[PDB]
């Protein structure tokens, strides 16, 4: 089944750090970064080759207008929220995430959520056409938005607009999104204090999902198994590492197994 996602996330900070823009928006198609805006450049730029190639100038112009408008709004939001919370300066952040998921072309979800200082603030519930106030300070926002018919507006963005563009993007980048990049795998060992820690590292795979298991003479022994999760490289591919603690001299006993879309049969690796 063909599953695709479109996701925008937006960050407005009072304290982004030296040299850093205080406002940033980025968009993802199937988890892959493809557009970017920040308050420094003040325009939307492509982050994949396929969006840069298939989109025209009017697309970027119009999107840049959206980005600038969002910046001005969140500039104001930061001020409104700090006063509502009785906070003067220091460090505060607004976060937005919203988007849609399609399966076989049909929408299966649409979300629009906000957080303040790292905590849920509001979430759109599309089913009941209501906004949820997660904290007392969000109650006037809920009341304001539902008063101005924001539910209908976000219902049509999420069910029509978001979905339409997602279907467009997936066709633009069909070859790229469906690409396969095979990991290079290395098993390494380090003994310290009567404990041999065996490491298995998968380098540069795409797509993101992967299963890396430690097999102890054939059986999926995930007891000592510590996974570092899946982490990104700078080049659009991913990385993961999984360790297992063993007894000294028990190294040729363990096998690393890597299951990934680029590998027709699972890879087996050892020290």
């Amino acid at each position: 089944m063909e599953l695709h996602t479109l996701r925008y996330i937006q960050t407005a900070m009072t304290d982004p750090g030296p040299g850093q823009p205080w406002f940033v928006t980025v968009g993802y198609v199937d988890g892959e970064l493809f557009v970017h805006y920040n308050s420094t450049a003040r325009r939307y730029v492509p982050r994949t080759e396929w969006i840069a190639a298939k989109a025209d100038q009017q697309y970027w112009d119009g999107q840049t207008q959206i980005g600038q408008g969002n910046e001005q709004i969140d500039r104001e939001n930061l001020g409104i929220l700090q006063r509502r919370y009785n906070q003067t300066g220091g460090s505060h952040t607004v976060q937005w995430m919203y988007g849609c998921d399609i399966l076989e072309g049909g929408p299966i979800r649409g979300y629009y959520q906000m957080a303040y200082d790292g905590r849920d603030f509001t979430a759109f519930d599309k089913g009941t056409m209501t906004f949820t106030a997660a904290v007392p300070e969000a109650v006037p926002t809920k009341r304001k938005w539902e008063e101005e018919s924001e539910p209908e507006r976000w219902k049509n963005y999420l069910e029509e607009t978001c979905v339409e563009w997602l279907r467009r993007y997936v066709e633009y980048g069909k070859a790229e999104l469906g690409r396969r990049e095979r990991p290079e795998v290395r098993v390494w060992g380090k003994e310290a204090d009567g404990i041999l820690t065996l490491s298995c590292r998968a380098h540069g795979f795409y797509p993101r999902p992967i299963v890396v298991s430690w097999l102890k003479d054939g059986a999926v022994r995930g007891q000592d198994a510590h996974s570092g999760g899946i982490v990104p490289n700078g080049d659009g591919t991913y990385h993961t590492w999984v360790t297992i603690d063993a007894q000294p001299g028990d190294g040729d006993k363990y096998q690393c197994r890597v299951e990934h879309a680029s590998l027709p049969q699972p890879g087996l690796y050892s020290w």
């Binding site: 119009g62 959206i66 408008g69 969002n70 939001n77 906000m114």
Partner: peptide
């Protein structure tokens, strides 16, 4: 295409 968020 992104959306416009709204003032809180």
């Amino acid at each position: 295409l992104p959306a416009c968020v709204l003032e809180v």
